[PDB]
């Protein structure tokens, strides 16, 4: 579950954009930037996925290509350009609290969930990412 501190939108960023990350090209990135997740889990979270572009790039995607959400529900949309990801997967010996993972670089157009902001929210940023499609 979400911690209920935390929104929705706030929890996409949490979890899914690193727009200041530079050991991003690091083969540890994953295992240093899954820490603050899984402080959050009882278990190490075993796939993660990262958007490393500024914040306003991410958010803007909800005004790009709106498509079928893969639950059939709300409003999701594809980015009109490839982003810079990076896939974590938990490696297999991994049992929390030592969650490794393996670092996997790509670029691939990101496909997200977007929604009115929650009231918790800033108010600069009146429509967010909430979810990936998947």
């Given at each position: 579950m979400r911690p209920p501190q935390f929104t929705r939108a706030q929890w996409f960023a949490i979890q899914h954009i690193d727009?200041?990350?530079?050991?991003?090209?690091?083969?540890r990135y994953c295992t240093i930037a899954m820490r603050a997740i899984n402080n959050?889990?009882?278990?190490?979270?075993?796939v993660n996925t990262f958007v490393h572009e500024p914040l306003v790039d991410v958010q803007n995607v909800c005004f790009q290509e709106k498509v079928t959400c893969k639950n059939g529900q709300g409003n999701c949309y594809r980015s009109r350009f490839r982003m810079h990801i990076t896939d974590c997967r938990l490696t297999n010996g991994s049992r929390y609290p030592n969650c490794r993972y393996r670092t996997r670089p790509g670029r691939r157009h990101i496909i997200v969930a977007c929604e009115n902001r929650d009231?918790?929210?800033?108010?600069?940023?009146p429509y967010v990412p909430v979810h990936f499609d998947a």
């Open positions: 727009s200041d990350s530079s050991p991003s090209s690091s083969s959050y889990r009882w278990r190490c979270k075993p009231p918790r929210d800033s108010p600069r940023y």
